[PDB]
Amino acid sequence: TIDEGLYSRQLYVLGHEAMKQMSQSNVLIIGCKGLGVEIAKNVCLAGVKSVTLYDPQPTRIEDLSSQYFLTEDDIGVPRAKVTVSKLAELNQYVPVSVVDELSTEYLKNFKCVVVTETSLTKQLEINDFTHKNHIAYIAADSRGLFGSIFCDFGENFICTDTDGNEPLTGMIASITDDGVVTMLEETRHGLENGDFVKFTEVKGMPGLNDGTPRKVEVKGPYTFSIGSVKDLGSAGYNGVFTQVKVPTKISFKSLRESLKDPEYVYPDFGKMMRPPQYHIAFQALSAFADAHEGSLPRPRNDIDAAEFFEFCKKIASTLQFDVELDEKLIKEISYQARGDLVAMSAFLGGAVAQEVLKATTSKFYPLKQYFYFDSLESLPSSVTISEETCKPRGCRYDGQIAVFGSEFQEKIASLSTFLVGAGAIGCEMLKNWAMMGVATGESGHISVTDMDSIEKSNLNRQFLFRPRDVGKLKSECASTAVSIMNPSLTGKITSYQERVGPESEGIFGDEFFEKLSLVTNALDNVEARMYVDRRCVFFEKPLLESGTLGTKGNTQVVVPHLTESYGSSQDPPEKSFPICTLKNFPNRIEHTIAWARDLFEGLFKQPIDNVNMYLSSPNFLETSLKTSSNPREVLENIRDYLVTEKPLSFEECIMWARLQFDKFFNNNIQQLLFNFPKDSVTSTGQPFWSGPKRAPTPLSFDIHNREHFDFIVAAASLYAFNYGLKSETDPAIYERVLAGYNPPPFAPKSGIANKDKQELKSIADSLPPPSSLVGFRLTPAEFEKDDDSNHHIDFITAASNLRAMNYDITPADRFKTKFVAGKIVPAMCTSTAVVSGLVCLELVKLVDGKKKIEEYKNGFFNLAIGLFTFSDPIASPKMKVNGKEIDKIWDRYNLPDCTLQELIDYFQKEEGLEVTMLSSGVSLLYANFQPPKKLAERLPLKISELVEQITKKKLEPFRKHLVLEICCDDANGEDVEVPFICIKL
Amino acid sequence: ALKRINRELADLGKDPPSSSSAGPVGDDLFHWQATIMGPADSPYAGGVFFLSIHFPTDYPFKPPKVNFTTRIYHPNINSNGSICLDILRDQWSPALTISKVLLSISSLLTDPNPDDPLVPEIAHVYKTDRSRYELSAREWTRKYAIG
Amino acid sequence: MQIFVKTLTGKTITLEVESSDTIDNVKSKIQDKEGIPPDQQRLIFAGKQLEDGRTLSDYNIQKESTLHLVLRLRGG
Numbered sequence A: 001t002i003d004e005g006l007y008s009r010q011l012y013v014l015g016h017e018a019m020k021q022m023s024q025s026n027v028l029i030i031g032c033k034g035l036g037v038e039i040a041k042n043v044c045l046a047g048v049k050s051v052t053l054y055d056p057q058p059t060r061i062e063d064l065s066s067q068y069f070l071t072e073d074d075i076g077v078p079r080a081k082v083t084v085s086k087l088a089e090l091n092q093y094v095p096v097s098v099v100d101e102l103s104t105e106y107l108k109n110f111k112c113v114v115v116t117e118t119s120l121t122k123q124l125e126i127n128d129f130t131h132k133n134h135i136a137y138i139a140a141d142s143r144g145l146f147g148s149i150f151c152d153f154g155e156n157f158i159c160t161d162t163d164g165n166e167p168l169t170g171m172i173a174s175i176t177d178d179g180v181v182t183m184l185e186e187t188r189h190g191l192e193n194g195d196f197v198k199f200t201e202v203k204g205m206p207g208l209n210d211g212t213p214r215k216v217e218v219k220g221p222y223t224f225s226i227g228s229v230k231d232l233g234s235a236g237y238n239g240v241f242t243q244v245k246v247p248t249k250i251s252f253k254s255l256r257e258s259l260k261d262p263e264y265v266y267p268d269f270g271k272m273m274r275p276p277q278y279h280i281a282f283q284a285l286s287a288f289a290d291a292h293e294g295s296l297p298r299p300r301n302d303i304d305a306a307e308f309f310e311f312c313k314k315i316a317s318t319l320q321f322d323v324e325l326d327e328k329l330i331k332e333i334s335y336q337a338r339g340d341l342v343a344m345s346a347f348l349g350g351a352v353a354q355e356v357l358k359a360t361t362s363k364f365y366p367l368k369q370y371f372y373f374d375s376l377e378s379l380p381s382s383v384t385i386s387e388e389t390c391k392p393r394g395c396r397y398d399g400q401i402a403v404f405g406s407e408f409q410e411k412i413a414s415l416s417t418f419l420v421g422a423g424a425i426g427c428e429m430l431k432n433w434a435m436m437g438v439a440t441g442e443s444g445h446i447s448v449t450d451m452d453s454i455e456k457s458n459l460n461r462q463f464l465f466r467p468r469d470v471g472k473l474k475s476e477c478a479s480t481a482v483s484i485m486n487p488s489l490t491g492k493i494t495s496y497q498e499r500v501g502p503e504s505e506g507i508f509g510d511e512f513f514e515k516l517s518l519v520t521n522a523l524d525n526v527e528a529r530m531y532v533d534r535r536c537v538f539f540e541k542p543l544l545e546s547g548t549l550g551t552k553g554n555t556q557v558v559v560p561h562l563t564e565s566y567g568s569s570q571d572p573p574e575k576s577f578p579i580c581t582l583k584n585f586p587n588r589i590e591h592t593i594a595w596a597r598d599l600f601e602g603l604f605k606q607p608i609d610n611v612n613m614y615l616s617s618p619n620f621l622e623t624s625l626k627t628s629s630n631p632r633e634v635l636e637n638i639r640d641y642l643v644t645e646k647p648l649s650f651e652e653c654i655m656w657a658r659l660q661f662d663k664f665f666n667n668n669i670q671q672l673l674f675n676f677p678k679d680s681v682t683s684t685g686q687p688f689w690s691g692p693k694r695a696p697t698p699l700s701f702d703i704h705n706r707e708h709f710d711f712i713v714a715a716a717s718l719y720a721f722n723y724g725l726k727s728e729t730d731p732a733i734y735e736r737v738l739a740g741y742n743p744p745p746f747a748p749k750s751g752i753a754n755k756d757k758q759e760l761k762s763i764a765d766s767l768p769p770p771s772s773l774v775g776f777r778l779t780p781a782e783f784e785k786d787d788d789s790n791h792h793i794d795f796i797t798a799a800s801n802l803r804a805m806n807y808d809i810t811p812a813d814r815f816k817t818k819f820v821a822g823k824i825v826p827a828m829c830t831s832t833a834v835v836s837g838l839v840c841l842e843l844v845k846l847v848d849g850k851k852k853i854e855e856y857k858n859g860f861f862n863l864a865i866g867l868f869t870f871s872d873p874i875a876s877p878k879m880k881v882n883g884k885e886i887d888k889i890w891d892r893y894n895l896p897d898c899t900l901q902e903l904i905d906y907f908q909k910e911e912g913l914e915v916t917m918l919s920s921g922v923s924l925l926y927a928n929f930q931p932p933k934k935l936a937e938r939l940p941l942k943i944s945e946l947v948e949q950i951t952k953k954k955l956e957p958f959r960k961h962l963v964l965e966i967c968c969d970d971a972n973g974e975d976v977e978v979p980f981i982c983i984k985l
Numbered sequence B: 001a002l003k004r005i006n007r008e009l010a011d012l013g014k015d016p017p018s019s020s021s022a023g024p025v026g027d028d029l030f031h032w033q034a035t036i037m038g039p040a041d042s043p044y045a046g047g048v049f050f051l052s053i054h055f056p057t058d059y060p061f062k063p064p065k066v067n068f069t070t071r072i073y074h075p076n077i078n079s080n081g082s083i084c085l086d087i088l089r090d091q092w093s094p095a096l097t098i099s100k101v102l103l104s105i106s107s108l109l110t111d112p113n114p115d116d117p118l119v120p121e122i123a124h125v126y127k128t129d130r131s132r133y134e135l136s137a138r139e140w141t142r143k144y145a146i147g
Numbered sequence C: 001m002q003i004f005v006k007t008l009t010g011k012t013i014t015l016e017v018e019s020s021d022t023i024d025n026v027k028s029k030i031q032d033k034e035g036i037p038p039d040q041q042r043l044i045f046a047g048k049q050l051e052d053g054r055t056l057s058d059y060n061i062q063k064e065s066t067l068h069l070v071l072r073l074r075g076g
Ligand SMILES: *P(=O)(O)OC[C@H]1O[C@@H](n2cnc3c(N)ncnc32)[C@H](O)[C@@H]1O
Pocket: A420, A421, A422, A423, A424, A425, A449, A450, A451, A452, A474, A498, A499, A500, A501, A522, A523, A524, A525, A528, C075, C076
């Protein structure tokens, strides 16, 4: 009973069984500060059965540093009481409760227990009970720029899926007598040693088809081994292997046992000696709090730091830790004890929420067992950070001032940022900015642009949007929500509804981009990322990129004159199948889905567009004949959709659907089998329909069959929608109208000066004149997946499954068909939180204006396997131009609006280079090989005039610069790379 | 994109392409018109075939869209001019120039591959009745590829 | 010398190299074992992204070292 209209993106990551187990699990959360509230929010959005909160501590002002469900009117009220009301709105299927008192025996009601803001003695008392009663225990901590996570899921945890990857499958070419399985030509199995596989459709060795998994011994990228198959047969031909994933037994240790001999997870291999330090440091923090009535060391206090280091030495002596304590790092942990950062809270909350989901679903590999993290490279160095500047001021930013100071707070409050996109990452980024106090000063401002509107499926991970907000613009709703969170942002946020691209340069122009401080991308496509990267490179602005995919994520930072841009690297492109495979010889459900999408486009979109264009353009026929490669198709489509097969009722739509069923699932297959019979052989004697090619079979229409009726209904409904008829879903009309169909006879055709022009002219003359039919338009079908009543996904699924039955392929369902055809990107709230935390940790580095490239970090992570890694950004390449060091990315030539001849003379006289090619946009302004007359015409013109003349379009009034690409050769004739030219209009 | 396109254009200009001639249309660098000469030892001998090449914005990281314009009777070229070449769909890498694409197209013209056809009827005629395929190809190249 | 490469999806790869090998040779070996073009590979060792044109000894990569093979993602 999972609501797939809300959990559409999350089910592509977890699955139906995982969410079914999730919806029966109870989660208790102790602590309702920023980390606790982040964990609770992510858990509520995930869809657990219920969430219970326990935090009787009255609210204090500093708690607002990372708690976004607390307002300044709630001071003196318990945090849980004022947080449950706001948490109860995130998801209607997840009740949120509050307990005013906690007892040990009360813990047996919960599937998972999360502990934050609790002393070590209480944690030991709770864990001693949860461990022996088989309850998952997670303990999280966030101290300044330091974080810790501990997981204990019991001694006999069972993990059904350890990596979250789809099972591997492949097509075999031959299996020898010794189990040497070989893949097809240039096909990689992708298996590892110790994996299990099962075989089907193997010819010559039926025994392998029973289904028992067999061990895999990888011998190469194309072959592996399964053992001795002597008894099963001598040799096997063809077949398909599929990986089998087996459960794993994971054993955890209790907190009391784990303190003595911890097992670390390393978020960064560049600093492998630190987690042992943090292990002692956090225990010393707990001891110090115990010795000082629960009070942490004061910010940047030396006496407290010395006492804390004494505690650290005592603990290291007691635990018999043979480690050398780094005094600077430990005292840094002491200084930032009272820090409460929203970025660290978001990062650790995403991680801990993912761990909670692992506990409640027995999926993905949990942490084992300690995860200590630091982002100490984010500490500012351009301001004064001392006891005087870090003391609390009695404001909501005390938690952040305790780490960064008041001067850095003033720097943050004067930011002028630009956020592109308002999706999940956009909402998280806006919330983090509101909590940090970004652009709350006199000179601060926030600009957020997004052209989309709120949908039901967006609410699952965009927590700023409520069901009442469906149908409104994302940017306005996000701005209002964040203004509610931080009232100081009233009037400091401007929201646009513009798509960022070449067509919006009149709004996001020179004046707009010259006032910014940084740009943050929250997009979901690569084209927009490349465009924004080019704009930032031209205007020399810092850029923050971030991306997610299911449980994986990455963040990158682009710094002017220091690092390379986003577009300086390549990513794996999408997989496009050969046209022959799609058109005639499919062997996967993806091929059939692509074919069905093409069929939908060619039946309900292209002919309608041709008909509409015929009735609008007064010179469409001649232009189509001249330009279009196959005008016959266009003319036939116009004729058929105008006069020949125009439906006067829904009955004719049903008959048309039946005719198309025959056309696409019975007759083309007969023609194909006539051309290539099932017993045909290739040029080398091998059978034609073997291996990647599957012999098809024509389908005979059966009304009672589900798939045939689904296709008929969907096609008839879509045709009626095209012609604006009253569609029906009553089976009686279909049954009574499809019983009188007379299939026209069909027999495959064997085949066996220039009059085709006369035929085209005759066909054109048969069409009614455009003047007679004015105002008559047919509505094209624009593909839309999120609507479950437009029959688009229904039609695509029916067509794909029918073609699968043609070629004996296993059909999919609406869920997988929508995933594949819709090109849906799996999404999670936890990954979004993690990436937002990392981006906001890099944002403070950008604000501080750090110059060295080793102080920035690009981050990558996969939460399904618990992998985190960081690497320095790549420095921008340098080159030698005219014996000068020139940056290959961030350097440009600035020139006035001079003539082409003057530009060539300048490059010859100043840089000593000969200009050979000069282009702007998509045109070719100048080339060395052009005829002398054309050049002599184009030489005395200014660059603006030349561009206007060549492009045949006047420059817009708001245009203030031109970007030119120039290729030039030196004196010796060697080509030399040069930066682009910025002509000032 | 512009830099790579101009470098390829200059490379074509410097080295004599002989049996090919590719160049931009008008002043647009993202739209080329190429000419291919039918191999002498083939049914398409003495024919001129026009191709349209559309470079995407992401060039050279996405393959160019190359489509025949002159009608040709080939098992691997359909009526829309689409060419069944692996280097244009999924085997494209940012290291192949248009010259190698034209050489691949010429090689495809010099010998078809009916075992993996794009036009099943032409492949059937080629596999069954070779002489009739030869006659049809000669008639088509005299009717469309000469002029 | 033998090194290990771990992918962002959890796969493990074993490579037989020498300390004098360039990053280009390592990328070619990874392409042979995985089919990923060398220009689309992002290798990380000890917090440093390996760049083409240098050698393993520049990064102090020794036997039984672990590299990470990562990539960028397009959701958001
Ligand atoms: P995720 O898919 O959850 O949300 C992505 C958001 O980014 C916005 N977006 C995509 N592409 C653009 C451009 N070119 N300009 C502005 N905004 C963009 C979507 O509308 C989503 O809100």
